Design a binder for this molecule. Structure first.
Ligand SMILES: Nc1ncnc2c1ncn2[C@@H]1O[C@H](COP(=O)(O)OP(=O)(O)O)[C@@H](O)[C@H]1O
Ligand SMILES: Nc1ncnc2c1ncn2[C@@H]1O[C@H](COP(=O)(O)OP(=O)(O)O)[C@@H](O)[C@H]1O
Ligand SMILES: Nc1ncnc2c1ncn2[C@@H]1O[C@H](COP(=O)(O)OP(=O)(O)O)[C@@H](O)[C@H]1O
Ligand SMILES: Nc1ncnc2c1ncn2[C@@H]1O[C@H](COP(=O)(O)OP(=O)(O)O)[C@@H](O)[C@H]1O
Ligand SMILES: [Mg+2]
Ligand SMILES: [Mg+2]
Ligand SMILES: [Mg+2]
Ligand SMILES: [Mg+2]
Lengths: 316, 316, 316, 316
């Protein structure tokens, strides 16, 4: 509770929104959106069921697909080292690290890739999952409920976790013209489950490279650099678990008008009505991220920003 | 019986017909007919056998086929949460929810998709039923009697339930010109079993979209909104089970003339004499829906209205 | 309804109770109790479930075990020719007769011996059932619910029928001193399921034999004799199906005292608290048999009479 | 919250403790302890984990083993109709009733007997579980965590439910001298998992029988009697779910002295140090049952009472 005191203070801050991303991964340089994306993903949408409106997921899934050597693997890793109930697990070898452990997890489930059925499961190399390990997630993302009835017994595991995953193209790189979506090795009906897909191509370019490298070296020498979180990870991890508890943003007519005015815009053009749902989740989380609990015109605004970005990137 | 008192009063109401639909699914916006359709389906036709006129089904089956993201899945779900003996079960995973349970069902049968052989079985994704799970229904809709003689034993299960199902095109979407009936993945001799098929395409259009979205948000925030039943679901569920008991509408010469005058109209034009039978069921149920028990010119009138609609929608 | 008129009149009759038995099997001579037993069995106990008092079977099962040539086979047969939904099926050969058929049965199930899962299944030669065909009944009598999950599928059939069965001793005859219950080839935990077991030994004796024979010949010559029902079987079959509908006897404090005063008596002495339950079923049915719907001191009285008889017969 | 108001008031009541049991099963007559036992079991022990003191189960398991016709089956059933997340499932046939359903359960798991991995699983006939269905529970009671790794995948289901089960002797009845514990068909290392085992033998005796019967009849006639809960089940079910939320009894030095003073007593004599743990759970729950949250000398007192009873019954 001495902590709750601090948190409120942080939120008070003017730039909190920005500070929170600059703390996701201080190491990796850039990727403001892929950071502000994961950021929301870690705060999640409202997720509050009603009887009349049955179930109501709020968890925000995020896919990271790109050419090799773009920091995907790296990034996920940094998230594990931050996110509370984080499970990193790359399609390669057996068993995984991630966790900072404390007598195991608070509630149910576990498995092969290693998912806690809550908790965010950072799945690197989702395109190299043995069709089995894939299937499960596919169900988990789709249904929101896994199930194993191998034997006379029938086991229905309740899936309630967030998935921040990475993935490479079926080819490795995809710079070609063809759509980034034919190049991924995942069944489209799975991809459609992510609320945001960051496509990461990598032209050469001097400027950026110079920056990126100079940056690596910097935060690569000794055991310290002026390149560490803008917010302590222990604080920021409490701050998260906190907002995913006491805050449940309600949509301001203010915002409402902004998101619909857009969904319709978005419609004019592989869009469905789902795009609207996920957009809602982002803007809800963007509020929770700062504790509101009112998705103001700004929140909703920001949400669409990030989304029209994920989108632009698809044109490559 | 303190209840029966209320019911009669409701029926007394001038707009009951309308109130009853605005209570099917207050959530989903629009689809007056797909609502007033399901409405009848929940009240069913006369269904009263005679020795001379052998068997006499009255149950009204309803199929909902459309492009994705049109509320099919959603809708069925809301029906389960209303309909008395409702069983929702979407072709995906194992076991299903629906029921509000009370020491199981009043009479016989059960199975794989999960049907109670009475009770309405809301079958979402009927186009993704394993050829086995399909077969059964096919028989159930066709015969009105299932059967399993796997072993020396022979089991003939009496099928007496209503089927309100959904389904997607073999392609996913079907906006093309080709007939909506070549695009469905169900054997025509099954489809022919539905008394009403609502074809749901989805052009974009601003107006409607704006409405739909604005609506979602509305009844999507907090745990309450001015968007709940025009009639309490507990009352309306008793009202149903009641009319499917004490009311057995007889056809008024009044109406008779209206439905035949039409069937013949309908004939001029993939129509049979079955179309006449089902039309009869609707108009009978539309009365029962308000308790008559006389299919007045209005009832019969309404019936054909809904039917010439289901029809218009086929031209797409 | 022109029928309902007659029925009420019959009940009005002073001797109805007696008339009803003299109509079970006019052929077979004697066995007043085995007749008045089956009689009750055909009318069944209350059988009305409550939420607080969960399930509530009322069906009365009856076992007939005796030396050969005592009319068991015969009797069951006559019952099939009377009882509404009757299924006769003797452990021998394949398929069975019984039914008077009419487009099959009103509700679910069917099988190997041939049972309709309602309807009374007259099972002759229950001691010669292939351990399989036995098992089922055993479950059916015990659970009140059968089940076949042979394959990936799981089938739980609701068992709701009456069982009036016959059976011979493991030896054929049992005149010996040893208890009639060690001589039957059925698992005691099955036998315990019957509400009445009529043990039929057959000493020679002139008097009785003379009667029995003289009787056979009588109702054995030509195609007619003064030995036909005291009540038309078509009437009496409606009368049954009627009382198993409109009558649901409630226990009069009057009777209550009689049955408990006895159960306790019965206790002093292979008795349990189940004996009390079944006794309750008889007395309830004995009322329904005449339509009450109040288990008067007489009904309850009669019930124990029949029961202390089934009992005396066990001493042989 | 209008409810929370009532609850507090009930607790205020002087006799609440007693009222709460007289509401478990008003039907079945007697068994004050088997009622006050189940009562505690429904309120559970503290169950609050710490890092230093690792895991900390609080759920109270209860076994009911006795001769047939003692109300075991019946009782469990009444509990299902009360307990919030209750699952009744008797080793017989397939699928089970219990639940009052509401879009399925709040959290994870499901299976063969049918358990929700929280919620109390009322398992009647635990001695007739197919060695498979047993195993699971055995693990569930022992580990507190189930697991299915059938295939490449590995599924660890978190077991966090209460088990109120019944069971018959390997012989059926056991009146003999031999210890009730050799007569049960369960592996001793399973039985040791129950916090209370009620052994139910059934001598005849007139007095009691007269009572029992008279009672049955009473609450067996019509659809009503002065034999219904001393507390409404809807209230009492909220009251439970409430105390299993806001109350977490701490042990008063007051009580502490009472339970240890006894454990040691208990030691003098198949006792371990586990007996102490479970005793602690009862007394904790007995407080929670009335909301304390301080296990006063009385609570602890009561706990040992019930326990020295379960014990006396073992001498038979
Ligand atoms: N934008 C970036 N910022 C910082 N480091 C980067 C960046 N892009 C690539 N790197 C470097 O690449 C390495 C990680 O490559 P990696 O993420 O594992 O490729 P992939 O995502 O395809 O598995 C790191 O050691 C890091 O120094
Ligand atoms: N007409 C509508 N009214 C209200 N919501 C709608 C409507 N159409 C689509 N939706 C939205 O779409 C979502 C449901 O899509 P869904 O019914 O599952 O597609 P499908 O029927 O193909 O499975 C809901 O969350 C809902 O908000
Ligand atoms: N009490 C009886 N009344 C009339 N006929 C009887 C009687 N007992 C035996 N019978 C005669 O026995 C024959 C039937 O024997 P049955 O019932 O088949 O022996 P079981 O019961 O062991 O199969 C009938 O033809 C009938 O004439
Ligand atoms: N103590 C009792 N109080 C009330 N009814 C009882 C009692 N004991 C036995 N019964 C009767 O026994 C029947 C239930 O027997 P049951 O519980 O199913 O035996 P078991 O527990 O071995 O399965 C009920 O219908 C009930 O009337
Ligand atoms: Mg990589
Ligand atoms: Mg769908
Ligand atoms: Mg024979
Ligand atoms: Mg039992």
């Amino acid at each position: 509770p001495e902590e709750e005191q601090i948190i409120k203070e942080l939120a008070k801050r003017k730039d909190i929104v920005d500070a929170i991303v600059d703390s996701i991964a201080p190491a990796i340089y850039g990727y403001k959106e892929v950071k502000k994306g994961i950021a929301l993903a870690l705060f999640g949408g409202v997720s509050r069921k009603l009887p009349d409106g049955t179930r109501l997921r709020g968890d925000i899934h995020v896919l990271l697909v790109g050419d090799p050597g773009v920091a995907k693997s790296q990034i996920l890793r940094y998230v594990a080292n931050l996110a509370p109930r984080a499970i990193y697990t790359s399609x390669x070898x057996x068993x995984x690290x991630x966790x900072x452990x404390x007598x195991x997890x608070x509630x149910x489930x576990x498995x092969x890739x290693x998912x806690x059925x809550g908790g965010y499961a950072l799945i690197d190399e989702l395109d190299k999952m043995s069709d089995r390990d894939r299937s499960v997630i596919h169900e988990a993302l789709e249904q929101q409920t896994i199930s194993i009835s191998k034997a006379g017994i029938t086991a229905t595991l309740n899936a309630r976790t967030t998935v921040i995953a990475a993935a490479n193209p079926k080819q490795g790189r995809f710079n070609r013209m063809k759509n980034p979506f034919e190049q991924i090795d995942l069944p489209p009906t799975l991809l459609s489950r992510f609320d945001l897909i960051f496509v990461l191509i990598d032209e050469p370019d001097d400027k950026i490279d110079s920056e990126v490298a100079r940056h690596i070296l910097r935060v690569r020498r000794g055991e310290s650099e002026v390149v560490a979180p803008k917010i302590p990870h222990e604080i920021l991890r409490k701050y998260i678990a906190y907002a995913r508890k006491n805050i449940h943003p309600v949509i301001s007519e203010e915002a409402m008008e902004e998101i619909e005015k857009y969904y319709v815009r978005m419609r004019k053009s592989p869009i469905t009505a789902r795009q609207l749902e996920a957009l809602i989740r982002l803007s809800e989380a963007h509020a929770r991220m700062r504790l509101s609990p009112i998705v103001t015109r700004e929140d909703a605004r920001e949400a669409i920003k990030l989304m029209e970005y994920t989108l632009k990137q698809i044109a490559m």
